[PDB]
Amino acid sequence: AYRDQPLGELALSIPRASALFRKYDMDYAAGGKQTLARAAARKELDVEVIEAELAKLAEQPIEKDWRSAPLAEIIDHIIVRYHDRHREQLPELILQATKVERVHADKPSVPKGLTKYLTMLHEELSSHMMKEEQILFPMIKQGMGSQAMGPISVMESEHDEAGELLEVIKHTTNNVTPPPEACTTWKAMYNGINELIDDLMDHISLENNVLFPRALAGE
């Protein structure tokens, strides 16, 4: 009964479901409590077809399941797999976008504003991740997860803001689709943007859907 399940649980229980939800622009990361039914209905999508596709993915080799993993292990995974990679990814994308916007300034397809939006994302995500690393993650490791309502509500609000920047980035780049006349830098940059989006949604999903609720529950 997949349509009646929350998007968060689906993304965390079925491998490559994340990419499927990315394809349909369903926010399993910050909107992970919403049922598939409501998500699909809002987008005028055929939920039976989506239920079928999830079933196909569900037959595949059962991946690493973070839902019951120890919180300290989730934390260490986040820091290394996501926070450190974002800190490397964003500066590079910023350089590339600066070049693309300059070199192709005359083209109507140029993603005007992209450098600015990536710069904002980098600045905001950097300060956010530092707060997590300095206070929230240590407090959870030190058994104070049940006391983290304050920081968690702020971090979740900031996750929603990161989502809004991702939407603006997607809009500016025609849903990260390079035009016919794009060359190697522009195409490679769009591949990097898709990778950043994929990673950031999975990162936010792991925080919002696993780490934060389990921490508050005293696990």
Residues that bind ligand O (CB under 6 A): 128-129, 132, 203, 207
| Residue closer to ligand O, measured from CB, 9 or 207 | 207
Residue 165 CB, nearest distance to Cl ion (Å)?
Answer: 23
Residue 2 near which of ligand O, Cl ion, Zn ion, none (CB within 5-8 Å, type-dependent): none
| CA-based torsion, 199, 159, 213, 129: positive or negative | positive
159 vs 163: CA distance, rounded Å: 6
Among left, alpha and beta (phi > 0; psi -120 to 50; other), residue 25 is left
At its nearest, how many Å lie between Zn ion and the CB of residue 5?
24
Contacting Zn ion within 77-136 (CB under 5 A): 132
Distance of CA 130 to the CA centre of its chain: 18
Nearest CB to ligand O, comparing residues 203 and 214: 203
Minimal distance, residue 128 CB to Zn ion, in Å: 6
φ/ψ (deg, to 5) at 58: -60, -25
28 scored as a contact of Cl ion (CB under 5 A): no
> How many residues sit close enough to Zn ion to count as binding (CB under 5 A)?
3
Helices (H), the chain: 7-13, 17-23, 36-42, 47-59, 71-77, 84-103, 114-131, 137-141, 149-172, 184-206, 212-216
Contact residues: Cl ion, CB under 5 A: 183, 185-186
Name the site residues for Zn ion (rule: CB under 5 A).
132, 155, 207
